[PDB]
Amino acid sequence: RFSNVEFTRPAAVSMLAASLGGVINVLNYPPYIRSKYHGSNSRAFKLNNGQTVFNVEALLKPELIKALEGIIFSNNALALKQRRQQKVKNIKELRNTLLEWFSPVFEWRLDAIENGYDLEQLESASERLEYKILSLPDNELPSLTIPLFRLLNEMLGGVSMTQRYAFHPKLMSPLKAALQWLLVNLTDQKHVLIEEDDEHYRYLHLSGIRVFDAQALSNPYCSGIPSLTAVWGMIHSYQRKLNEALGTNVRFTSFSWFIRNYSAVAGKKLPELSLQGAQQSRLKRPGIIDGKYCDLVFDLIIHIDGYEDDLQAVDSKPDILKAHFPSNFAGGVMHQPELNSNINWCCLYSNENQLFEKLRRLPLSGCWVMPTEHKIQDLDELLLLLNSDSKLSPSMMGYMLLTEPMARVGSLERLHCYAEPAIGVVKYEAATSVRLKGIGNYFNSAFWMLDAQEKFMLMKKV
Amino acid sequence: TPQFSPKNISPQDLTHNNILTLEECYVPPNVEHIFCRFSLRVQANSLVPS
Amino acid sequence: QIEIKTSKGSCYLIDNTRKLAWESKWASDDLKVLEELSNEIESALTDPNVFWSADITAKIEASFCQEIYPSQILNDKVKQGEASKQFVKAKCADGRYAVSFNSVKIGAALQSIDDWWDEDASKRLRVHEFGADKEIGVARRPPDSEQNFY
RNA sequence: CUGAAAAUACAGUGGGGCCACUAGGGACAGGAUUGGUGACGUGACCUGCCGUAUAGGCAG
DNA sequence: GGTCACCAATCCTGTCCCTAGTGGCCCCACTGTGGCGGT
DNA sequence: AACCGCCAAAC
């Protein structure tokens, strides 16, 4: 998927631009959030790790048993656990796939208390919102599990049609699905974390943030969401202003980013009149540069570290916290939600359970921007990996330094360096997937940090 | 249950009723006889297939 | 009728904008609204440790099937199939586009305050480093003069 | 301390003229819905007077 | 004082047409938005 | 020498 950027006189830009008549192609993978209709086990069968039939049914196994017996480097039992570490994540993925549609059904049945997409058609669909899956409560349904065990009989007809039923493990997969039930629900999990410290940490939840005309071109290769370095830079500017205002020394270490609304804005931007340079600098209009712009509504969760003296100095001043929230984002104008919305848009949290209890009330159509750990050696692997999964997107990760930092005339700072924008991959996970995957998964595998090293500065996990 | 085992719902809910909305036909009081009449026509349709 | 709601919790109302101008003498209540909101904006401009937002709504008594004049997009590479004149849109909660003004268009209107460029200047220019006049297409504070910003 | 700061796309506008969907037409044969069922007694609406009056008015 | 009885049933046999055709005329905008070496 | 000239074409 590619979108176009046109240039007026391409020969002035480069020879590559001149060869293509100024029409440069950029990777177009924006988030797709729809308000409308819900229209089966469908979401699993579609996720196709998953089910219906194949890629990769059937194990039928022999495959799984052989893998465990090979991993029996270090003692049959210790091997099965080492197999499980990858094979349990693989066995967890099978349950997560199966749950993708159970997630959708539940979801509907909340919004509704009425409906699915189609109430009767759902009731007809072998794995949809049944008044039996209706409950008991989430919590008691997971505590019951029972539903998960029953669905194993239904998985004699779909979630692998016929073959590979008693075969290496089906019992172990059923047990994992029965365990996932307990994880799938509610009023459970809760506590004990080396992150951040603890002496304590804080969680700053910014909700319903509206942005108008932010640069959709993250780097000049990729189009879609704004750059994560833009989100980092905004959060760092917010930290600096707060630490200089209050006289504290708190650190805004990591953030998680949830997009509610996204829309592409048509048209180019007209530059104002200025002294345009020549042999004689004249007051005129500069050249019209084509770009990509988006209107988006999002939530940020920022993870604050420091001393409790500084944290309770921050918590004591809510107006001064609100005051230094920036109004710039990726070139666009950034506003708090409307004054008649009745939304407290700048909230602090001391514990994780209270924050997750607030966070699972988000709109279900919205997308979590999630970090991945996929490896890419060239463009063709990335394109195959993009043609594989429909919810992955190529985005800006950060800067690979070309030259050595040194004193250069016209530099903003003491040392200047020329760098190259690095292309990575993000995941647009649904709100429901993050809700069912549990509090631990969310607080470990949703938060971005800037790995600032000698020769590169890249956005990554942890 | 389907294989004869009592499932545990309230002891008070077993003596509980169902509301039935029926139509009822009774003879009016002090009407001695009722009448049922139908007409029967017979045709010779079993000699030849239609 | 212009309604202004503030993050502070104020609620200002101008009843009819046809009765106001830049140079005309206003009523007392409209001057009170000006005074109060000017104080709030000045407080927001001068103190870094206060948050200040405002929701500003104009309610216009429409004529029967009256024409609306929103922002027009910049397009110098229009195709044969497309419209030569298009409008700036904002997508709603559903898949419907409200016709809208650009932020810079509103910004340009609010900062049309500069009438210091002459001793008896009637026109108010949009604040520019060289006092650029869009209608005439000249600089009112030219680069060769001492009236420009630099 | 954000592929960093800053940014008014605008003015004008006549789709018009003409117009025949038509002709023809078998939905048809057969049919057992059936068995079984308690609306109230933890409640206010009482006790009297006037009046020819199951009319109509009144006292606690 | 409160609920809206269970036990099974959804029919088989045959077909959706033929003819002919979707117009002429004229037109699709003016303003602005360039860096760089040289005579 | 300050000001007319040279230069591109993808689906």
Beta-carbon contacts of residue A103 (< 8 Å; ≥ 6 apart): A43, A430, A432, A433, A435, A436
A36 touches C: beta carbon within 8 Å = yes
d(CA A114, CA C96): 26
Q: Which two tokens stand for residue A397?
A: 């990760």
Report how far residue C116's alpha carbon sits from residue C111's, in angstroms, rounded to the nearest whole number.
13
Measure the CA–CA gap between A36 and A105, rounded to whole angstroms: 15
A9 is near strand F: CB distance < 7 Å: yes
Distance CA A396, CA A398 (A): 6
- The whole-angstrom separation of Cα A401 and Cα A60 is 50
**Experimental technique:** cryo-EM
For residue C72, what are the β-bridge partners?
C87
CB A260 within 8 A of CB A428: no
Cβ pairs A/C, distance under 8 A: 70
Closest nucleotide to A269 by C1' from CA: D7
Chains A and C touch (3+ CB pairs under 8 A): yes
> Which residue among C53, C73, C130 places its CB closest to the CB of A336?
C53
> Which chains are within 8 Å of C by 3+ CB pairs?
A
> What's the half-sphere exposure (Cβ side, CA atoms, 13 Å) at A417?
15
Contacts of C101 (CB under 8 A, 6+ apart): C70, C71, C88
Task: For residue C86, list chain A residues with Cβ-Cβ distance below 8 A.
Answer: 266-267
Nucleotide E28: closest residue by CA–C1': C80
Amino acid at A392: L
CA-to-C1' span, C77 to E4 (A)? 70
Chain E footprint positions (protein CB, under 7 Å): 2-5, 28-30, 32-38
- The answer to whether the beta carbons of residues A374 and A117 sit under 8 Å apart is no
- Strand D positions within 7 A of protein Cβ atoms: 1-11, 13, 29, 37-39
Which residues have C-beta within 8 Å of that of residue A307, sequence separation ≥ 6?
Answer: A199, A249
Distance, in Å, from the CA atom of C102 to the CA atom of C58, rounded to the nearest integer, reads: 16
Q: Using CB atoms and an 8 Å cut-off, which of residues 1-40 of chain C contact chain A?
A: 5-7
What string of H, E and C letters represents the secondary structure of chain A? CEEEEECCCHHHCCHHHHHCCCEEEEEECCCCCCCCCCCCCCHHHHCCCCCCCCCCCCCCCCHHHHHHHHCCCCCHHHHHHHHHHHHHHHHHHHHHHHHHHHHHHHHHHHHHCCCCCCHHHHHHCCCCCCCCCCCCCCCHHHHHCCHHHHHHHHCCCCCCCCCCCCCCCCCHHHHHHHHHHHHHCCCCCCCCCCCCCCCCCEEEEEEEEEEEEEECECCCCEECCCCHHHHHHHHHHHHHHHHHHHCCCCEEEEEEEEEEEEEEECCECCCCCEEECCCCCEEECCCCCCCCEEEEEEEEEEEEECCHHHHHHHHCCHHHHHHCCCCEECCEEEECCCCCCCCCCEEEECCHHHHHHHHCCCCCCCEEEEECCCCCCCHHHHHHHHHHCCCEEEEEEEEEECCCCECCCCCCCCCECCEEEEEEEEEEEEHHHHHHHCHHHHHHHCCEEEEECCCEEEEEEC
Q: Which residues make Cβ contacts (< 8 Å) with residue C30, sequence separation at least 6? A: C14, C19, C20
* Both structure tokens of C41: 């904006």
What's chain B's length in residues?
A: 50
| C143 contact A CB<8A | yes
**Triad C29, C32, C36: Cα angle to 5°:** 145
CB of A289 less than 8 A from some CB of C: no
Between CA A280 and CA A54 the distance in angstroms is 70
Q: Which two tokens stand for residue A16?
A: 């590559």
* Residues of chain A positioned with their CB less than 8 A from the CB of C89: 266
**Sign, CA torsion C137/C138/C139/C143:** positive
Encoded amino acid at A439, one letter: I
**Kindly report the CA angle at A409 between A405 and A414, in degrees rounded to 5?**
45
C chain contacts of residue A324, beta-carbon cutoff 8 Å? 48-49
